[PDB]
């Protein structure tokens, strides 16, 4: 639905109308796509890039690109202007997928690889993903967790500790078992989540590009290849949180977050308990901002050894540094990412750089 029609920029001589619409074979109107593609390619000057065209006149958010070799190329995605607030949170994944599908076939000697139908086949997957991605009564859950405190509460604490670690720093979970998506929505609309944790978890399950929950109806197996998942996007803040019965996640630890879950379980009510989790998120964000400010006021000089001394001295002012400081470090590393700047990046990301 949001993906109206895709196109391929062929700027060899002048321009090439290589349009590949969705739900219809090709290379709102027929010529409108070609006109928008020509308008987007007319501004392509002579020297992997990115572009954006929020055309409010005709109502087409053409997120076009610029690819290079022998001539100039590019991929264009025409989307209506009615999904302005919808495409922005999904732009970080769409641009990454476009760059990934365009990098395969970008060389200087010979990078053809029969780029005739494979590009359309790869774009169809993203089109279907975007079309499917478009379109939890904790009053009893907390009571059951407080009553049992052996299975449900333990699994919740384990999931929170896994999502508050470097392995799942940004909503690391794909699928566990069954089709009960209640726990996914609970983990989404609570702490240890991202969109303000409102547009992170959605449809298009089964190993999507990037999201917060992929709770498909997996009643037989995982519906995915473990080596493929470990070779595709393993160097990333994502994990396989198996919440079937009891299983922790990793990326091939208790912290201060356990006190939060204990307070949630021991606090009766749960009819208007959203204020407490809101205050918890508020103080967590305040601590993250304090940590990033304390890092910035020391790394602003650009000195590399000054960052190590600052990180060593921050352990005294940090409550239970190490195991409990993992979530704080993850937040301080994900806030700017979402010589001084390279040093700060290398300090905030030390084990997440082995993706070569």
């Amino acid at each position: 639905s949001p993906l109206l029609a895709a196109t391929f920029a062929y700027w060899d001589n002048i321009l090439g109308p290589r349009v590949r619409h969705i739900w219809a074979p090709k290379t709102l109107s027929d010529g409108e796509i070609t006109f928008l593609a020509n308008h987007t390619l007319n501004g392509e000057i002579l020297r992997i890039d990115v572009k954006f065209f929020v055309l409010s006149e005709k109502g087409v958010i053409i997120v076009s690109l610029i690819f290079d070799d022998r001539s100039t190329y590019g991929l264009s995605i025409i989307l209506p202007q009615t999904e302005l607030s919808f495409y922005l949170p999904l732009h970080r994944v769409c641009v990454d997928r476009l760059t990934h599908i365009i990098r395969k076939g970008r060389i200087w000697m010979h990078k053809e690889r029969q780029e005739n139908v494979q590009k359309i086949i790869l774009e169809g997957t993203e089109r279907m993903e975007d079309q499917g991605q478009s379109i939890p009564e904790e009053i009893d859950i907390a009571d059951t967790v407080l009553n049992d405190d052996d299975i449900g509460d333990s699994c919740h604490e384990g999931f929170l500790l896994n999502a508050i670690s470097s392995h799942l720093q940004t909503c690391g979970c794909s699928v566990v078992v069954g089709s009960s998506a209640e726990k996914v929505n609970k983990i989404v609309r609570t702490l240890c989540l991202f969109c303000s944790r409102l547009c992170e978890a959605e449809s298009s399950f089964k190993y999507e590009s990037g999201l917060f929950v992929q709770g498909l109806l997996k009643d037989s197996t995982g519906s995915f290849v473990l080596p493929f998942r470990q070779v595709m996007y393993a160097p990333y803040p994502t994990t396989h949180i198996d919440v079937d019965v009891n299983t922790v996640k990793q990326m091939p630890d208790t912290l201060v977050k356990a006190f939060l879950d204990q307070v949630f379980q021991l606090k009766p009510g749960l009819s208007l308990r959203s204020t407490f989790l809101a205050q918890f998120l508020l103080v967590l964000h305040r601590k993250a901002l304090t940590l990033i400010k304390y890092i910035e006021d020391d790394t602003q000089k650009g000195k590399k050894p000054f960052k190590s001394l600052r990180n060593l001295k921050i352990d005294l002012d940090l409550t239970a540094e190490g195991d409990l400081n993992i979530i704080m470090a993850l937040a301080e590393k994900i806030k700017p990412g979402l010589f001084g700047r390279p040093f700060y990046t290398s300090v905030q990301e030390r084990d997440v750089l082995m993706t070569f």
């Binding site: 929020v54 606090k267 205050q279 103080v283 964000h285 304090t290 400010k293 600052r310």
Partner: protein, 421 residues
């Protein structure tokens, strides 16, 4: 670097902000790319000059004008779009005013041409085909005036203004420049603070809950603040008496000691829309009456109210304090200094507020009641003597929720021990 002005409305354009030679070398290219595909459009298609990311916004009958914003991402873009919308609206209003003025001038010129043509016809009536070019020019002027009037009517249906728009666009960019990486963070923090302060509760059940807990409760700047909290002997009992609710007045001879007390006011918890109305710094006044008939923050000149003189300072209970005073004083005794202590204090304050909220909820949902309340306090919310500030904040938030904000004070029967030396 790059200038966050983007003054380019001609591309054939206005000095706003420029410090790099590449600035007004990629600005022309951006303006040309924006004017190539021409209405109200807004597109940001890449950049150049070592990654100088920008965002453009925008003979003939109209003049192609646009405004750019070069800033070396989507959250900041959506944040600046809200201001650029009003900027473009004001620019369109100014352009419509200029078009109305031009249409009035064209109508005056057409009237003058019609009068000249009438005079020429009257002069030629006293003597064949004449004044044909004048009649053609008059007809063309009338057609142009009609077209301008139609355009003005369409613009209305669908100087000072330019200077106001320029000042607005220049003052709105300062916030985006200061929050180039913290705009979305501040936005979400403000939204969360608003959604936490708005709670609005449920029905008469919660009304009676609040009434019952209230009845049961009755029948029983940053740099200077860090510099003062660091170099201060026996600051833990002082901050304990300040946070527990005891009035901490300052006594000094000069005005510097009285002005420094206003810097440490970011730790005291308020009780109403205001913070401290009776605040007479560096002014001799009979504070003996104001200490019991006014707010809990006031100062008096030298020449349960703990007095902090220039040589000594009183305290509420310096024999045994809670773990909050060391946790708040360790930051001043560390490398953390400068625009960080205020945020740390605010985080600790909201954490204490959430703790007192949970304390009230647990105490009202779980001689037998006092024992359970003390057990809950000792299990969480207090360690050694922090069970007083928690109850104080709890009573304060309970009175604030009941729409009853102070002159209800409270006396804490504890040894003063004002030596602190």
């Amino acid at each position: 670097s790059r200038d966050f002005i983007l003054i380019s409305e001609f591309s054939e354009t206005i000095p706003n902000d420029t410090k790099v030679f590449g600035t007004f070398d990629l600005n022309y290219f951006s303006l040309r790319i924006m004017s190539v595909d021409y209405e109200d459009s807004k597109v940001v298609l890449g950049d150049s000059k070592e990654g100088a990311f920008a965002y453009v916004h925008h003979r003939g009958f109209v003049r192609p004008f646009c405004m750019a914003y070069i800033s070396a991402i989507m959250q900041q873009f959506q944040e600046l779009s809200a201001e650029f919308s009003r900027a473009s609206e004001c620019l369109k209003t100014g352009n419509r005013k200029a078009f109305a003025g031009e249409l009035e001038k064209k109508l005056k010129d057409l009237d003058y041409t019609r009068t000249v043509l009438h005079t020429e016809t009257e002069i030629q009536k006293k003597a064949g085909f004449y004044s044909s070019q004048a009649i053609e020019k008059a007809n063309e002027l009338a057609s142009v005036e009609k077209s301008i009037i139609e355009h003005q009517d369409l613009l209305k249906q669908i100087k000072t203004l330019e200077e106001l728009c320029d000042t607005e666009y220049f003052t709105q960019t300062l916030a985006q420049l200061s929050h180039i990486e913290h705009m979305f963070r501040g936005d979400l923090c403000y939204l969360l603070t608003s959604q936490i302060d708005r709670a609005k509760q449920q029905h008469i059940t919660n009304f009676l809950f609040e009434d019952f807990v209230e009845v049961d409760d009755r029948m029983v700047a940053g740099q200077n603040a860090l510099k003062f909290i660091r170099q201060y002997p026996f600051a833990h009992p002082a901050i304990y008496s300040l946070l527990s609710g005891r009035t901490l007045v300052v006594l000094g001879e000069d005005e510097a000691i009285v002005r420094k007390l206003v810097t440490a006011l970011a730790i005291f918890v308020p009780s109403y829309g205001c913070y401290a109305k009776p605040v007479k710094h560096w002014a001799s006044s009979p504070l003996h009456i104001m200490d019991f008939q006014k707010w809990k923050l006031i100062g008096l000149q030298r020449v349960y109210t703990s007095i902090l003189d220039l040589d000594n300072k009183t305290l509420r209970c310096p024999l045994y304090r809670g773990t909050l005073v060391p946790r708040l004083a360790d930051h001043r005794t560390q490398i953390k200094r400068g625009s960080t202590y205020y945020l740390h204090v605010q985080s600790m304050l909201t954490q204490l507020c959430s703790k007192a909220f949970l304390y009230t909820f647990c105490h009202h949902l779980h001689l037998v009641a006092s024992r359970q309340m003390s057990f809950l306090k000792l299990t969480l919310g207090l360690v050694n003597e922090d069970v007083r500030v928690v109850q104080y904040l709890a009573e304060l938030l309970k009175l604030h929720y009941m729409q009853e904000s102070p002159p209800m004070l409270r006396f804490d029967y504890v040894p003063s021990f004002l030596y602190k030396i």
